[PDB]
Copies of this chain bind each other. A is one copy, B any other.
Amino acid sequence: AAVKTLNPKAEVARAQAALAVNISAARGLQDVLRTNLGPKGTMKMLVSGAGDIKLTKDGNVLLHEMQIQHPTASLIAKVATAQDDITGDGTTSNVLIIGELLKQADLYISEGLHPRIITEGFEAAKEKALQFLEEVKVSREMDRETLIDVARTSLRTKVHAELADVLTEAVVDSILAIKKQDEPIDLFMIEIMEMKHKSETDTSLIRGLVLDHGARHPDMKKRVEDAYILTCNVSLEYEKTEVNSGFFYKSAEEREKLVKAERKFIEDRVKKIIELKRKVCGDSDKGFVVINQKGIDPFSLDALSKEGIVALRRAKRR
């Protein structure tokens, strides 16, 4: 054709070819994803090239994990990815409705109707459908019971029913806890930690925090009852000077003095923490936990343990 006369190694699908290709790929994706829909849907197993296993009923995960190299499939995967990034639900239904629109339009295009006319009808129907949607939507006081019904309607599609009955209360309580009236909900404020030891119905909501790390000094306590928490982003390990410095001494005694001196800068911050601890906990009744976004060297860890502080290092910026 025209493009193939200029670029001989060029691939081209024309008006009937192009439409057939696109609609065929859309219906293929639809045929795969039809089974994901609803709580009675089936779980697919997905094995990476390394051998890793994924059990999913989620349309977006299934799309991105299937082994597909089709342009129409890429288009629909991206629209579904946007659906997932903005709403969290609707990917399976998205793919299904796309495939069904394409099929029902091909029904009339194969009999010679123009796709422009089909798309005009699409625009009219979109308008009327959005109107009817706003009309049928139920404006409801969002009580715990309503939110539970919503979260159930989603989790029962994604997992088994008993595990869904657990995750429902977990999710609803978490959101009802991190939400301030008339203030957009920051889902970042719900941490999600995975533990790989017990049953799946042990999944719970900790009304607090769970860090995936602990203290690195053994003499530090493993349990603290009434704890003062110090959230810091201050280095408590050895910091070298920005400008190149270096130490110069003429004797082992001077070397020893410089070794003791090079840590004074961080020792001072350790002492500040320790003095705050002593002033707030005049005894061992209460506890003191330092949580550092940055490091804490062994000398500082020893200094804090000696004073009875539990220090965790390299926490998360969130």
Q: A: which residues have CB within 8 A of B?
A: 16, 31, 103, 107, 110
Q: Can you tell how many copies of this chain the complex includes?
A: 2
Q: What are 3 A-B pairs at a CB distance below 8 A?
A: A16-B31, A103-B110, A107-B107
A99 → B minimal CB distance (Å): 11
Which chain B residues border A31 with CB–CB below 8 Å? 16
Docked CA distance A94–B16 (Å): 23
Which chain B residues border A110 with CB–CB below 8 Å? 103
Docked CA distance A16–B28 (Å): 12
Docked CA distance A103–B110 (Å): 11
Docked CA distance A107–B107 (Å): 9
A28 nearest in chain B by CB position: B20
A17 → B minimal CB distance (Å): 10
Docked CA distance A291–B131 (Å): 90
A153 → B minimal CB distance (Å): 25
A137 → B minimal CB distance (Å): 29
Docked CA distance A107–B103 (Å): 10
Docked CA distance A144–B107 (Å): 45
Docked CA distance A103–B111 (Å): 12
A37 → B minimal CB distance (Å): 14
A72 → B minimal CB distance (Å): 17
Closest 3 CB pairs of A and B: A16-B31, A107-B107, A103-B110
A26 → B minimal CB distance (Å): 13
Docked CA distance A157–B287 (Å): 100
Which chain B residues border A107 with CB–CB below 8 Å? 107
A16 nearest in chain B by CB position: B31
Docked CA distance A107–B31 (Å): 15
A23 → B minimal CB distance (Å): 12
A168 → B minimal CB distance (Å): 32
A34 → B minimal CB distance (Å): 11
Docked CA distance A103–B103 (Å): 13
Which chain B residues border A103 with CB–CB below 8 Å? 110
Docked CA distance A19–B304 (Å): 74
A103 nearest in chain B by CB position: B110
